[PDB]
Every structure is written in C-alpha cells, then in structure tokens.
Design an enzyme around this catalytic site. Structure first.
Site, short mmCIF file in Angstrom:
data_model
loop_
_atom_site.label_atom_id
_atom_site.label_comp_id
_atom_site.label_asym_id
_atom_site.label_seq_id
_atom_site.Cartn_x
_atom_site.Cartn_y
_atom_site.Cartn_z
CG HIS A 184 -2.12 -1.01 0.91
ND1 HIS A 184 -2.14 -2.22 1.57
CD2 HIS A 184 -3.20 -0.95 0.08
CE1 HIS A 184 -3.21 -2.85 1.13
NE2 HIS A 184 -3.89 -2.12 0.24
CG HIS B 266 -1.84 -0.05 -4.40
ND1 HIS B 266 -2.43 -1.00 -5.24
CD2 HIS B 266 -2.80 0.50 -3.62
CE1 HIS B 266 -3.72 -0.99 -4.92
NE2 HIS B 266 -3.99 -0.12 -3.95
CG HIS C 245 -7.67 3.66 -3.71
ND1 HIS C 245 -6.63 3.84 -4.60
CD2 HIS C 245 -7.63 2.40 -3.22
CE1 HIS C 245 -5.99 2.67 -4.64
NE2 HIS C 245 -6.56 1.77 -3.84
CG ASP C 246 -5.23 1.87 -0.60
OD1 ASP C 246 -6.13 1.66 0.24
OD2 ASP C 246 -4.91 1.03 -1.49
CG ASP D 86 -8.28 -1.17 -4.47
OD1 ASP D 86 -7.02 -1.06 -4.42
OD2 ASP D 86 -9.02 -0.90 -3.51
C1 LIG Z 1 -5.71 -11.72 -0.07
C2 LIG Z 1 -5.43 -10.66 -1.08
N1 LIG Z 1 -5.93 -9.44 -0.89
C3 LIG Z 1 -5.58 -8.56 -1.85
C4 LIG Z 1 -4.79 -8.80 -2.99
C5 LIG Z 1 -4.73 -7.52 -3.63
C6 LIG Z 1 -3.95 -7.29 -4.88
O1 LIG Z 1 -4.74 -7.51 -6.04
N2 LIG Z 1 -5.39 -6.60 -2.95
N3 LIG Z 1 -5.90 -7.24 -1.85
C7 LIG Z 1 -6.59 -6.49 -0.78
C8 LIG Z 1 -5.64 -5.50 -0.11
C9 LIG Z 1 -7.91 -5.93 -1.31
C10 LIG Z 1 -9.00 -6.77 -1.45
C11 LIG Z 1 -10.21 -6.29 -1.94
C12 LIG Z 1 -10.35 -4.96 -2.31
C13 LIG Z 1 -11.63 -4.47 -2.89
F1 LIG Z 1 -12.55 -4.27 -1.99
F2 LIG Z 1 -11.50 -3.33 -3.57
F3 LIG Z 1 -12.14 -5.31 -3.72
C14 LIG Z 1 -9.26 -4.11 -2.14
C15 LIG Z 1 -8.05 -4.59 -1.66
C16 LIG Z 1 -4.28 -10.15 -3.14
O2 LIG Z 1 -3.57 -10.55 -4.05
N4 LIG Z 1 -4.66 -11.01 -2.13
MG LIG Z 2 -7.66 0.35 0.56
ZN LIG Z 3 -5.83 -0.01 -2.98
#
Ligand SMILES: Cc1nc2c(c(CO)nn2[C@@H](C)c2ccc(C(F)(F)F)cc2)c(=O)[nH]1
Ligand SMILES: [Mg+2]
Ligand SMILES: [Zn+2]
Ligand SMILES: Cc1nc2c(c(CO)nn2[C@@H](C)c2ccc(C(F)(F)F)cc2)c(=O)[nH]1
Ligand SMILES: [Mg+2]
Ligand SMILES: [Zn+2]
EC number: 3.1.4.17
Lengths: 348, 343
Positions: B83, B87, B123-124, B235
């Site tokens: 983050h 990103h 957003h982050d 995201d």
């Molecule tokens: C377990 C896991 N979590 C992940 C990954 C990624 C990268 O693509 N981001 N995230 C989290 C931080 C995340 C989930 C969901 C949203 C949403 F709400 F926007 F959909 C945002 C962010 C990943 O590869 N694995």
């Molecule tokens: Mg976030």
């Molecule tokens: Zn993000």
C-alpha cells in the site's frame, strides 16, 4: 392505510419573519431557558422565530457572522422539509433543537465543547429527521424504497437521508448559513453534522455505549478530542429523547403519537403481506410494558450518563425515572393491546 | 511494521504534460504494466493521463494547482511493501485503461469518470500497512475517529484527500460551483468507501442483479453500482496482468500482511490465518481470493462490457497458475529472502 400518507408542503413568511427583528428569548417566554419548559406548547407559527432567538442567545449569529435573512430562509426551508406523521414532524425537530439550547444554558456546555461543535449540534438537531416518512429503517429495506437502494449498503438508511436533505438545503440559493466559513471550517462543519445526525440511529448509540460509560467513569476531559466526539453523540441522543424529561402529560401524549405512527407502519406492512415487529403491531403491542422497557433500557441510561458527566443534569434523570414509574402505574389500569379505537390515551 | 511518511514542481511544469505514446507505445493497452514505470516518472504520467482524457480542459483545471495536487498525493503515501504510491499509481493507470478501452463515456457522466480517476489516486492515502480489524484491535486514533461508523481506513483515506484539497494551492476544484464541489466530494467519498472489501460483500447481490437485468444509463442506482464495481476492478487490477506481476504482488501483499501478524502476536493477540506467517499457505489463500473476490468482479465487468473479456480470461489464467503452483509450493509463509522465485 390512508393514515400512512404523510405529505410534503413543497419541493426539495420570510420578509414577515424578520420585520420586527429577532425576539429576545425572555420575550418568547420567561421560562424559555428552563428544563420545565415544554417546547411543544409554542405555536408552530412562532417556532422559526424561536430558532433565530436561540441562535442569537447562544451568540452564534454574532460569533459566526450569520446573515439573518439567510438564517430565516434556512430555518423556513428546514421546517418545510418535514412531512406530517404523528411524531416525526417539524414540532419534533423544534423540540429537539430547544433541548440542545437548554443543555447549553443549564449545563454550561461552553466549558466542555468548542463553540463550532455546539453550533453543529444545534443545527444537526434542527435537521436530524428531515423528510422522515413515519417509517423506520427496516421498513425502507422491506418496501424496497429509493432510500434503501441508496443507503442500505452504507448503513443507517433514514439518518443518511436526513443528512443528504440537510446538505441539499445548504446548497439551495440563499440558504447557506455557513457562507462566512473558510473552505476548511465549512468542511469541518459538514463533517460534524454528518457524525451527529448519524448518532441518532439507535444502533450507533448501542455501538458506542461502552465508550460513553468509560468516559463517564474516568471523567470528561475537555483536552481529549474523542471525549468531544462521544459527548456530541450522547447529547444528540439526549435531545432526541427529551420528551421523556418533561411532565407526565407530555410523555403520555408523545407515547400516543409514537404508537399511532408505529401502528400505521405495522398496518401498512400487513397490507403488503408481511409480519411487522411486535411493537408496530396493534394486535401484539402492550404499550405500558413497551414504554417501561424503552425507559429502562434506552432513555434512563442516557440521562444517567448525562447526570454522571453533569451534576446539574440530575433533575432530567429524576424526571425520566418518575415517568418510568408513571408507566408502571398505567400498566395496572390499561387492559388493551394497541391503542383505544379513538387513538387517545385520555381514558387514563 | 515501521512505514515512514517522507514529509509533513518546476520540473513537472517544464515537461510534465507529455503525449502518452512518449511514455510508452503500449501505455493505453491492457497489457501495459504501470509498475514498470520508474517512480520518478509517475507524477508526469498522471498529468499525461488527465490531459489525454481531456479532464484538464473540460473542467478548467489550473495546471500549477494540478501539479501541486499530484505531488501532495504522491507524498501522502507511506512505504509499506504494497500500500504505497506505486499501488495508487497503478490503480489510477487502470482507471485510465477503462476510459481508453471500454467507452465509459457511454455509461457514466464525465464528472463520475473524473471523480473515479481522482479517487483512484487518493484511495489508499496514508495507509499504515494494516487492515481495518487491526485499527480496532490496536485502539488507534483512526479507530477512535471512524470505527463506530465503519470502514476505518477508507474513511481516513477520504479525509486525507480532502485535507490535501484544503491545502493552499492544491484545490483543483476551487472554481467549481457549490453544488458541483459538493457532488465531486460526495462521489470521492462513495468511491473511496467502495474499496473496503466489507462494502463489496454488502453490494455484490445488487451488482449481480444489475448485470442480469442489464445496465440502464438512466438508472441512478446503476451509475452508483457501476462506480463501485469499476473502483474495485481498479484496486485489484494487478490480477489482470501476467503471471510475474501476480507472483510479485503476492510477495508484496504477504510481506505486508505477515508484518501485521507479527505486530498482533507482539500485542498478545492471535492474528487471522492470512496474516500469520506460521499458518498462511499463500497459493491456497490466493486461489480463495481469486475465486471469491477477483474473478467475480472481472466476470461482472465482462458481462457489462464485452470488451473486458480479456481481463477476466487473464484473472482466470492466473488463478489456474496458483492451483498448479499449489503442488510446487510446500511451505507456509514466505522464504527467508521474501521471494516467490522458487516457482
Ligand atoms: C488476499 C489478497 N488481498 C488482496 C490482494 C490484492 C492485490 O490484487 N489486494 N488485496 C486487498 C488489499 C484488497 C481486497 C479487496 C479490495 C476491494 F474491496 F476493492 F475489492 C481491495 C483490496 C491479493 O492478491 N490477495
Ligand atoms: Mg484500501
Ligand atoms: Zn488499494
Ligand atoms: C419505543 C419508543 N421509541 C421512541 C420513543 C421516542 C420519544 O421519546 N422516540 N423513540 C424512537 C423514535 C427513538 C429511539 C431511540 C433514539 C435514539 F437513538 F436517539 F436514542 C431516537 C428515537 C418512545 O417513547 N418510545
Ligand atoms: Mg431519526
Ligand atoms: Zn428525532
């Protein structure tokens, strides 16, 4: 089912309002700044002037350089923004706003909160139930309303609508009372109103209840920012339930209004082929036990916290406890479910 | 778990607005990897994308104010493994790709697209490398401010964005009318809030329903839902790239998560499996994440925009790669050097 129809007088008086200037609070009533004043006794046509009088007495018009014609237009737009259900109407918002003014005068809030925070609390009181439909949040979801479509995903459906309606008024030509604020302070003001209006959802109150209890236990710290936030929520709930701090005749009349409104929702839910919750069902609801439960589990603990924080609030807790005792007496001479056929509690 | 803030323009005014092909011939393609662009060129690329989408002229954006805003946003991110600013830049780049490839101007209002892009950048903001549950468990000032309201970090990211707009010489929306300014901030609030996974879980039923009945451009609820869907697709866009990208981002994501888990153990708390380096099996967790979260988002995007089929196919292919790897992988957590190269 026609009793569930609550109209809007206009769409989402003024020169006559400011003709003789802002009336000093004592000229409205010598008892105006007292916990024994019943704001619902004030003629509806005099309430807009009373809002201006309170804001002037709390020195907010002078401190924030509020343009009086803009304030008059805003007050009238807010008043017009309420529909006419038995309880959730402008007289309810007016009564809640008056109680905020009573807390300021009697509890010396200026020694606990920032000026801007008290001003945001007062404005939030005025706006906190804007455009209420005489139905609760669950009904919004069940009826698959435009409001549930917009806000169920972010929680507190009606409360988010009340806030959005307040912003819509501030954005109406000639109603922006916060025009003397910098971009930073205007933003702070809208963020305070958002949080305070959201604090009127009972689910929010129950979520912060342990934090409120801890603040009352350790004692209020004016240099603590979280204490300011928690106190604003507690005060908003105290204003929203302030009819319970009045005389027996007020609490009894408010129960009649609340249950007429609740029962109309339950009847509408029945006409929709659904089963309403017990307290909204005129065939299941036992008003005295429901009022006792409400007093013991919701209202009395709010005023007990208020007394724990402010010793001068002792009389409010005592009055709510006395009204709870009155409901106990009513429970021994009220032999019906729902309300009588004439919807009046005068038979007592 | 210590992630620093770097602080508390002329170069960008000289040649910050470059034509996008000068950045890369593949810059406007779904096969572009924005993480490949040097960090020092990202502010120029943000400006180039805003110019290429014609938002600067359409909204009469003052260029020095825009340059100051972009620099402030970039400085507003800390340096956790995932983050960080790279990103947010990559998320913003994907929003640009959606504008360039999916004809968004036929589904959303120009102002909604503009708010989506600015929300991507912001957003982050000020992310601490920890999730919402951690904020509550650590009794942080952020949880004190927002936990009773929900979506702790997302409410903070939006507050940080507004604090930047309210910084002298950074208000890119200053000239907007009161109604339009309010509309923009409300869109940014809603869009940034849609990045909380908890929010996605609560709206999935409505998103599925919209894709089933078909997008209606005169339906206000459809615009709101589409913005949430687009924001989550931005995201999670690293999942739409090639295998090397998804493997590297899993390294970054889990180095970040495991650090939070270590911190939770030090607090005497039991972290959830995903955050525990001694319990987490990365391929299993990645397959579950792809199946439940990422793939349904890209399938809904393909349903509404047939031109997005290539994105869903890439996400499905990366999920298949994790399943194959879930045999060539036997260890929990990450190796000593934190690299997934052993696959
Ligand atoms: C377990 C896991 N979590 C992940 C990954 C990624 C990268 O693509 N981001 N995230 C989290 C931080 C995340 C989930 C969901 C949203 C949403 F709400 F926007 F959909 C945002 C962010 C990943 O590869 N694995
Ligand atoms: Mg976030
Ligand atoms: Zn993000
Ligand atoms: C059962 C019942 N509900 C009542 C009454 C009153 C009037 O005093 N208001 N309400 C509801 C609308 C109400 C509850 C709770 C909050 C809070 F969140 F602010 F506390 C606000 C409002 C009453 O007498 N009985
Ligand atoms: Mg309410
Ligand atoms: Zn109310």
């Amino acid at each position: 089912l026609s009793t569930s129809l609550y109209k809007k007088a206009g769409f989402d008086e003024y020169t006559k309002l400011l003709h003789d200037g802002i009336q000093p609070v004592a000229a409205i009533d010598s008892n105006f700044a007292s916990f024994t004043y019943t704001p619902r006794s004030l003629p509806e046509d005099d309430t807009s002037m009373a809002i201006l009088s309170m804001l002037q007495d709390m020195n907010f018009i002078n401190n924030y350089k509020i343009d009086c014609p803009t304030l008059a237009r805003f007050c009238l737009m807010v008043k017009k923004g309420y529909r006419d259900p038995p309880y959730h109407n402008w007289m309810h918002a007016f009564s809640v706003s008056h109680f905020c003014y009573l807390l300021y005068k009697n509890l010396e809030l200026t020694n606990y909160l920032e000026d801007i925070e008290i001003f945001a609390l007062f404005i939030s009181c005025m706006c906190h139930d804007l455009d209420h439909r005489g139905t609760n949040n669950s009904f919004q979801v069940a009826s698959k309303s435009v409001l549930a479509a917009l806000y169920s995903s972010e929680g507190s459906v009606m409360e988010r609508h009340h806030f959005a309606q307040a912003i819509a008024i501030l954005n109406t030509h000639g109603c922006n009372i916060f025009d003397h604020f910098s971009r930073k302070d205007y933003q702070r003001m809208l963020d305070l109103m958002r949080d305070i209006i959201l604090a009127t959802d009972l689910a929010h109150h129950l979520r912060i209840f342990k934090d409120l209890q801890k603040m009352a236990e350790v004692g209020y710290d004016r240099n603590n920012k979280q204490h300011h936030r928690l106190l604003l929520c507690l005060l908003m709930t105290s204003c929203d339930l302030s009819d319970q701090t009045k005389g027996w005749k007020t609490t009894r009349k408010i129960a009649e209004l609340i249950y007429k409104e609740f029962f109309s929702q339950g009847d509408l839910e029945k006409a929709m082929g659904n089963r309403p919750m017990e307290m909204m069902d005129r065939e299941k609801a036992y008003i005295p036990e429901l009022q006792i439960s409400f007093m013991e589990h919701i209202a009395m603990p709010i005023y007990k916290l208020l007394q724990d924080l402010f010793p001068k609030a002792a009389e409010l807790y005592e009055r709510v406890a006395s009204n709870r005792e009155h409901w106990t007496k009513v429970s021994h001479k009220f032999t019906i479910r729902g309300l009588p056929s004439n919807n009046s509690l005068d038979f007592l």
